[PDB]
C-alpha cells in the first residue's frame, strides 16, 4: 500500500521560496526537481564496482524523463486537455508499476479501431507518430531537454534496448 509517488509534489500546492528551501523509499527535498532526481537514485542506485555504468545512468535518466512526462501531461492545464484530446490513459496518482510500464510508451485509445494501444516514446514525442510536432510541444522545457539528451545517448539505436532492459529490471518487484 506504500507508494513513493504519494510523497512527490507534482503540483502547485506548497509555497516554495528560496528561504523555505534553504532550511531543507521516500526521496528528500522540498521541490519536484530535487525529489524526482532523488527518487531516481533510490530506484537506480550508483553501485561502486558496477560493470557498464552507462546503461544504468541512462536508465536513471529515463526514469526522470518518464516522471516529468507524467507531470507535464497530468498536472498542467494544457497537458490535461492534450490527454483528453489524445485519449491517453494515465492514472490519477502514478505508481511504480505505471512508471515502469512507460518503458513501452504512451497508452492511448486508437482513434480508428477504438482499442487501447501503446505508442513508443520515440515515435510519440518528436517521432514518426508526431510529424505534427504537437506532442513534443506539450512537454516542458526541462522534459524536452532531457529527452533530447537521451536520444543522443542511451536512446541511440545501438543502446536503447539495453537501456530499456536495465530500466525494466529495476521494476521487477512490481510486475
Amino acid at each position: 500500500r506504500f507508494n513513493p509517488f504519494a510523497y512527490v509534489d507534482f503540483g502547485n500546492d506548497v509555497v516554495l521560496t528560496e528561504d523555505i528551501l534553504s532550511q531543507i523509499m521516500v526521496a528528500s527535498g522540498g521541490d519536484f526537481s530535487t525529489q524526482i532526481f532523488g527518487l531516481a537514485k533510490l530506484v537506480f542506485p550508483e553501485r561502486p564496482n558496477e560493470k557498464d555504468p552507462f546503461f544504468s545512468n541512462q536508465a536513471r535518466n529515463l526514469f526522470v524523463i518518464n516522471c516529468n512526462i507524467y507531470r507535464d501531461l497530468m498536472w498542467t492545464k494544457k497537458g490535461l486537455e492534450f490527454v483528453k484530446r489524445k485519449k491517453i490513459i494515465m492514472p490519477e496518482t502514478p505508481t511504480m508499476f505505471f512508471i515502469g510500464s512507460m518503458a513501452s510508451g504512451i497508452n492511448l485509445i486508437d482513434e480508428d479501431t477504438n482499442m487501447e494501444k501503446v505508442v513508443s516514446l520515440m515515435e510519440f514525442f518528436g517521432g514518426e507518430e508526431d510529424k505534427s510536432g504537437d506532442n513534443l510541444r506539450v512537454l516542458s522545457p526541462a522534459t524536452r531537454n532531457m529527452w533530447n539528451s537521451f536520444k543522443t545517448m542511451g536512446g541511440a539505436r545501438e543502446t536503447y534496448s539495453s537501456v530499456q532492459g536495465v530500466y525494466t529490471s529495476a521494476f521487477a518487484p512490481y510486475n
Binding site: 502547485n12 526537481s33 557498464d52 490519477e92
Partner: protein, 200 residues
C-alpha cells in the same frame, strides 16, 4: 518595467561574458573528428574498436579537448542567469503594484531563464555526445561497444554531471516561476471534472 523579462540583451551579456571559454567548440570538434576519428570505421573487431576509442580519447587530451570546460561554462551560465532573474523578480515584486502585470513579468522572467538554460544545455550536450561520431562507427557496432565507448570518451561521465545541472536548473525555475505552470490539487480536480476524464 522597461528593462525586465530577462530580455535578449541581458541574455546576450551573459553569453558574451562566458564566450571565451567555448571558443568555437563546433569548429574544434569538427576539425578534431575529421582528423582523428575516421579510422574507427575500419576497426577489425570489438576489441580493436575499443582500443581505437581509447586512442581517440588520448588524442582528445593532446588536443586540449576536455568536457570540464563545458561543464564549468554551464555552471557559470546558471549562476549568472539565476542572479539576474532573481534581481529582476524581486525588483518587480517591490515596484509593480498591478498584480496581474506582476504575474506576467514573473512568468516571462522565469520562462526565459528556463528556455535560455535548457537551450544551452542541449547545445553543449549535443556537442559532447558527437565526440562519438556515428558516421565513423564500424558495421558490427553493437550496444555494449557503444556504451563502453561512451565511458572511454568521458561522455558517460559528462552525462552524469548533466544530472546535477539539470536538477539545479529545475529547482531554480520552480523558485523563479513560483511553480505557476502546474495546477494546484483543487484546480486539477476541477479540470478533471470539467474535462470529464475518468482516471484509473
Amino acid at each position: 518595467g522597461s528593462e525586465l523579462g530577462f530580455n535578449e540583451a541581458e541574455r546576450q551579456k551573459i553569453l558574451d561574458s562566458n564566450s571565451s571559454l567555448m571558443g568555437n567548440a563546433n569548429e574544434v570538434r569538427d576539425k578534431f573528428i575529421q582528423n582523428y576519428a575516421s579510422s574507427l570505421k575500419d576497426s577489425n573487431d570489438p576489441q580493436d574498436f575499443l582500443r581505437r576509442v581509447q586512442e581517440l580519447r588520448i588524442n582528445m587530451q593532446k588536443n586540449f579537448i576536455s568536457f570540464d570546460v563545458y561543464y564549468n561554462y554551464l555552471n557559470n551560465l546558471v549562476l549568472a542567469s539565476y542572479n539576474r532573474c532573481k534581481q529582476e523578480k524581486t525588483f518587480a515584486e517591490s515596484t509593480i503594484k498591478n498584480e496581474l502585470t506582476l504575474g506576467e513579468f514573473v512568468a516571462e522572467i522565469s520562462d526565459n531563464f528556463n528556455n535560455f538554460m535548457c537551450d544551452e544545455v542541449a547545445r553543449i550536450s549535443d556537442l559532447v555526445a558527437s565526440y562519438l561520431p556515428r558516421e565513423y562507427l564500424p558495421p558490427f557496432i553493437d550496444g555494449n561497444m557503444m556504451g563502453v565507448a561512451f565511458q572511454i570518451l568521458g561522455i558517460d561521465d559528462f552525462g552524469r554531471k548533466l544530472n546535477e545541472i539539470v536538477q539545479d536548473i529545475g529547482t531554480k525555475y520552480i523558485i523563479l516561476s513560483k511553480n505557476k505552470t502546474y495546477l494546484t490539487s483543487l484546480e486539477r480536480a476541477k479540470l478533471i471534472t470539467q474535462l470529464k476524464l475518468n482516471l484509473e
